[PDB]
Write a protein that binds this ligand. Structure first.
Ligand code: NAG
Ligand code: NAG
Ligand code: NAG
Length: 208
């Protein structure tokens, strides 16, 4: 008998640990159409400042890390209560650049990792809030990213004028940044971290 499944049951759907929020994704079923869900402390008591979003069409529950989770060793823990019309509780856990500059380019190199059936993978993202991860080679090269690939590494070369490079100016200082997402995939759980490849020039050098 596996007692750890009696005290800590496995959620029958997916969970996503985002940079700013937790998305719990329930399995689609007519029986799950008769469920209600709420965020609770390990005793089942409502957490006071926690506000969360329910989407009945996508069957998702979204909660911020602040006020909705408890800090545990290695990261954050959240508890939800699921009720019919017998009740069940589930707990979730979320854990807490080699850039090269050039006169007209920035360059960086990233591992081709791609690997208990756990996967690790990288992706390039562009835009602010509305956009998505353009990881796919057609999209990345449509944004101007030239790519060198060997058995062990992936190396990117992008001009500063490229659409995939966000450019910031605060007075005389200039900053070039490509955002990256490191994605881990496990059965029933996705975990996403954020990262950047950043190349700031010298103001005198940038002024030419
Ligand atoms: C909830 O918000 C109130 C408002 O100031 C604050 O006093 C309290 O500490 C908060 N509780 C938390 C963050 O657990
Ligand atoms: C979360 O807790 C903080 C405590 O500093 C409070 O200021 C805030 O209003 C609470 N709610 C949200 C949605 O952040
Ligand atoms: C891209 O670089 C070329 C040559 O360096 C330049 O002519 C062009 O204006 C740049 N694109 C921009 C600044 O959008």
């Amino acid at each position: 008998i596996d007692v750890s499944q009696l005290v800590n049951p496995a959620f029958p759907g997916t969970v996503t640990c985002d940079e700013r929020e937790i998305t719990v994704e329930f399995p689609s079923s007519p029986g799950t159409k008769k469920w209600h869900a709420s965020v609770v402390d390990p005793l089942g008591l409502d957490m006071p400042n926690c506000t969360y979003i329910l989407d009945p069409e996508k069957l998702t529950l979204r909660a911020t890390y602040d006020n909705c989770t408890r800090r545990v060793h290695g990261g954050h823990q959240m508890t939800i209560r699921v009720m019919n019309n017998g009740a069940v509780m589930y707990q979730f856990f979320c854990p807490a650049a080699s850039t090269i500059c050039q006169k007209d380019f920035m360059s960086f190199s990233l591992p081709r990792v791609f690997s208990t059936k756990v996967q690790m993978g990288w992706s390039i993202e562009v835009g602010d809030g509305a956009r998505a991860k353009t990881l796919t080679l057609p999209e990345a090269m449509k944004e101007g990213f030239s790519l060198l690939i060997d058995n062990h590494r992936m190396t990117f070369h992008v001009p500063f004028n490229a659409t995939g490079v966000t450019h910031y100016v605060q007075g005389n200082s200039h900053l070039y940044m490509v955002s990256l997402k490191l994605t881990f995939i496990s059965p029933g759980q996705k975990v996403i971290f954020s990262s950047q490849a950043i190349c700031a020039p010298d103001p005198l050098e940038h002024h030419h």
